[PDB]
């Protein structure tokens, strides 16, 4: 009921800017600052329902329709930037995560909002965990924790201590993977109660930044990809026969005589179906890629801006990204009066490997 | 606190076979910023109003 691949292509007059070269679908109504994080509502939904977070402090969230109509529903707000935003698995919540160390559940139906967790530093990190004996939120911060919550009561139901600060993590139950500062990577074994599985020396030198959990043939997580601050990303295996074959690096997110210049791993999101990944970066660019094959699927258009975040609806027929600066160059280069925008493309037959 | 030092994009090498002269287009890919995230950076910059 419906169309798989609806929003059609943009034309140029038959008889000259740089904010959207692939001429992708524009959110309407888009934050009025910088974009952090992005999600889409599960399957439970009808519908596709978008989930934005800025540094405006605000959460937004949208209607998208087949046609690529986009249409504004709803809007929270914290007392500072939103890092993370992730659903319920029922689709009738939206869980946030701030700057203002809290973070809050959204119940999208009545419009309410309540705080349900607390961090001592910033929360970087928010995910769903649903398990066949127990449902919690997992929160990880700056304060060096990852902190487990139901919900319903201000005491967490478990505190894990991180070797450094929170900088990214995935959930796909049973397997949580966390990446902390100078280059701390765990993953987390979520059966009964959550428990930590393995410390992973780092396959990259440097500074991380985003994080994938993927899926094996039978549908059961078996790896994750990692993103660094250097244009490159790692794709490692949880047990594979051969590790030193097996996991791998690629370069990526790079431009080039002169220097190559190398940009930030901003973003990193697996196609729901096949597989396949997108990765965003510093360099204003979105990639394609098939880990497989080892292949580079598609690059675009370069953006006159960062992209910050990306991700796919529940059956991946729709990709959304955000063109925001992400700071990668500091202060100098933040151009407040410069305009965000979330763009959707149709993308899953350019996922699809052939 | 915050980006208060200049940004200069380190220099490296890599190959690609090439060899190939590269510049880091990432703060914290800078000695002074190492040790802190994009996002940490923002934050204390959005703090002391320096945007």
């Known amino acids: 009921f419906g169309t798989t691949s609806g929003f059609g292509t943009s034309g140029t007059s038959m008889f000259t800017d740089n904010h959207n070269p692939m001429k992708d679908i524009e959110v309407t109504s888009s934050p009025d600052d910088s974009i952090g994080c992005l999600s889409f509502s599960p399957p439970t939904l009808p519908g596709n329902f978008l989930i934005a977070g800025s540094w405006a402090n605000d959460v937004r969230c949208w209607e998208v329709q087949d046609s690529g109509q986009t249409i504004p529903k709803a809007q929270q707000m914290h007392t500072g930037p939103v890092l993370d935003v992730c659903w319920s698995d029922d689709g009738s919540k939206v869980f946030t995560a701030s700057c203002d160390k809290t973070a809050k559940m959204w119940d999208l139906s009545s419009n309410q909002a309540i705080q349900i967790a607390q961090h001592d530093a910033p929360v970087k990190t928010i995910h ?107 794709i490692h295996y949880i047990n594979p026969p051969n590790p030193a074959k097996d996991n791998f690096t690629f370069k990526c997110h790079r431009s080039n005589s002169a220097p190559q210049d190398i940009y930030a791993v901003n973003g990193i999101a697996f196609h729901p179906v096949h597989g396949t990944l997108a990765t ?75 | 606190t915050g980006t208060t030092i200049k940004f200069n994009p380190p220099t490296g090498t890599d190959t690609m076979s090439t060899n190939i002269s590269t510049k880091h287009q990432c703060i914290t890919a800078m000695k002074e910023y190492e040790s802190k995230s994009l996002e940490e950076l923002r934050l204390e910059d959005y703090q002391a109003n320096r945007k």
């Open chain 1, 128 to 234: 769903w965990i649903k398990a066949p004996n127990y449902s919690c939120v997992m929160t990880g911060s700056w304060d060096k924790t990852l902190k487990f919550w139901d919900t319903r009561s201000s005491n967490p139901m478990m505190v894990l201590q991180l070797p450094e600060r929170c900088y990214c993590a995935d959930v796909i139950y049973p397997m949580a993977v966390v990446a902390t500062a100078e280059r701390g990577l765990i993953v987390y074994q979520l059966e009964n109660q959550p428990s930590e599985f393995r410390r992973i020396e780092s396959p990259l030198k440097h500074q991380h930044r985003c994080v994938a959990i993927f899926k094996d043939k039978q549908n059961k997580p078996t790896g994750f990809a990692l993103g660094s601050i250097e244009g490159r990303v790692a």
């Open chain 1, 280 to 354: 965003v970066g510093s360099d204003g660019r979105f990639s394609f890629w098939d880990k497989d094959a080892r292949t580079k699927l598609k690059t675009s258009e370069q953006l006159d801006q960062p992209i910050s975040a990306c991700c796919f609806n529940h059956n991946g027929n729709i990709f959304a990204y955000a063109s925001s600066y992400d700071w990668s160059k500091g202060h100098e280069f933040y151009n407040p009066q410069k305009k965000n925008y979330i763009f959707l493309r149709n993308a899953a037959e350019e996922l699809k490997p052939r």
